[PDB]
Design a protein around this nucleic acid. Structure first.
Ligand code: MG
Ligand code: MG
Ligand code: MG
Ligand code: MG
Ligand code: MG
Ligand code: MG
Ligand code: MG
Ligand code: MG
Ligand code: MG
Ligand code: MG
Ligand code: MG
Ligand code: NA
Ligand code: NA
Ligand code: NA
Ligand code: NA
Lengths: 17, 158, 207
RNA sequence: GCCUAAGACAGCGGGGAGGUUGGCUUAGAAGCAGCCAUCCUUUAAAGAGUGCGUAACAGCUCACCCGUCGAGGC
């Protein structure tokens, strides 16, 4: 349900950091 | 620079996230821009997975869209008009296709396949059905495969 | 004489006897998809079969006696490396150009070296700060952060023809996405009409 | 006794591919959480994958082939 850079269907993932 | 990005999206249903999302936003392009026009070129294609290439320049602003050819498992479900296939392949039918049907699929994917002959493109496609619980000509596909080789059908070709 | 080997030599001999020009090609280091692409494109112009080098050599020597042809026994001398039989009607020189056309650029990795010059071209490389700067350290690629993004200082020469590319000078070039050397079917030697043509001779151009 | 100079064991180097992210399931599930299937193609060969690994991909590895080595292996 949440994170940064971490999934495939909902909306979180990855990037800068 | 120019970077090309391919993702497979649900045709017509493309959203701002993720799959398309983590794949472009690093290209410094606006997100919906490359979404509207996808659901444009995939209208006909509603509900199915399709490859989409987005040719972006990161420099000066611009993108472009190449709609590709859906995977094989996809093309199979809309000759069957289905959405989800078997949970236990070979333990349940879902799931029936006629040999002329499979042929029509084979010509669509043959140009991305290794097979240089129609009959081999078809044997490929039949293999994919063996994974899905689909049958062809009312029998296991592993069998139709044997038969094409045994020279049973043969009229459907050349 | 494992039965498969006798039929193998038989199959090779067939190919050799079957066309006027017989070539040994090195197939090594060509990744499969490229090889599939190439087999596909030249499919009706040539036949190409990979086998063990020892069997390609019998097949050549035996074929030579059946045909009473001493100089395609001599072709076995060139069977080396990733060797494969290729037989066709194209004169050798056309074959050479056909195969040169179809090569492809690939990353250089650790311990080989320079077919030509490599090189790094400058501006932004795309990456955020990190270990990658403390990677253009060693190599003598001058580097710093410009606009919050990794960038090299220069259009340099790190190498030149004839001396060694470091193991990790190479995997830098790979992450930079740089492809200095060509790979593909590489001709070891080509027999036609009582002559063995070697890569030297097949190369020559118009001056 | 069988395999082995038409190349043993071990090491090292390269290849290890395409349909395809197989179906399902799942936020994700791409060879490698789990369930089911496990075919076909280019092939010298290459599992719908042996183990690491990753959120998932990626990457590393292994089977398998070729090379190198050169006398042993069950
Ligand atoms: Mg094809
Ligand atoms: Mg030897
Ligand atoms: Mg060995
Ligand atoms: Mg190895
Ligand atoms: Mg390797
Ligand atoms: Mg899936
Ligand atoms: Mg799975
Ligand atoms: Mg992988
Ligand atoms: Mg996993
Ligand atoms: Mg097979
Ligand atoms: Mg003994
Ligand atoms: Na080589
Ligand atoms: Na693939
Ligand atoms: Na879950
Ligand atoms: Na999985």
């Amino acid at each position: 349900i949440a994170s940064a850079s971490c999934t495939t269907x909902i909306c979180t993932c990855s990037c800068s950091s | 620079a120019k970077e090309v990005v391919e993702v497979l999206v649900t045709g017509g249903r493309a959203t701002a996230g993720p799959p398309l999302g983590p794949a472009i936003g690093p290209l410094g392009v606006n997100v919906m821009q490359v979404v509207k026009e996808i659901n444009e070129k995939t209208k006909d294609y509603e509900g199915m997975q399709v490859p989409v290439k987005v040719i972006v320049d990161t420099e000066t602003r611009k993108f472009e869209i190449e709609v590709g050819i859906p995977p094989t498992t996809a093309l199979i479900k809309k000759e069957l008009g289905i959405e989800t296939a078997a949970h236990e392949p070979r333990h349940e039918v879902v799931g029936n296709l006629t040999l002329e049907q499979v042929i029509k699929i084979a010509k669509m994917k043959k140009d991305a396949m290794l097979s240089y002959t129609l009959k081999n493109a078809v044997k490929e496609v039949l293999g994919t059905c063996g994974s899905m619980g689909v049958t062809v000509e009312g029998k296991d596909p592993k069998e139709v495969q044997k038969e094409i080789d045994a020279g049973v059908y043969d009229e459907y070709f050349k | 004489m494992a039965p498969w080997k006798i039929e193998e030599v038989k199959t090779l001999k067939g190919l050799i006897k079957s066309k006027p020009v017989v070539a040994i090609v090195d197939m090594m280091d060509v990744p499969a998809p490229q090889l599939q692409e190439i087999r596909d494109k030249i499919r009706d112009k040539v036949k190409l079969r990979m086998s063990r080098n020892t069997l390609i050599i019998r097949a050549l020597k035996e074929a030579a006696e059946e045909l009473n042809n001493p100089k395609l026994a001599e072709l076995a001398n060139y069977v080396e490396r990733g060797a494969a039989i290729l037989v066709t009607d194209m004169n050798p020189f056309k074959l050479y150009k056909l195969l040169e056309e179809n090569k492809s650029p690939a990353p250089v990795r650790g311990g080989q070296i320079a077919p030509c010059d490599i090189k790094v071209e400058k501006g932004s490389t795309g990456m955020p700060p990190g270990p990658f700067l403390g990677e253009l350290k060693s190599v003598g690629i001058p580097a710093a952060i410009e606009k919050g993004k990794i960038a090299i200082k220069e259009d340099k020469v790190v190498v030149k023809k004839g001396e060694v590319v470091s193991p990790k000078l190479a995997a830098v070039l790979d992450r930079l996405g740089i492809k200095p050397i060509k790979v593909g079917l590489n001709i070891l030697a080509v027999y036609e009409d009582g002559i063995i043509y070697t890569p030297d001779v097949l190369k020559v151009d118009e001056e």
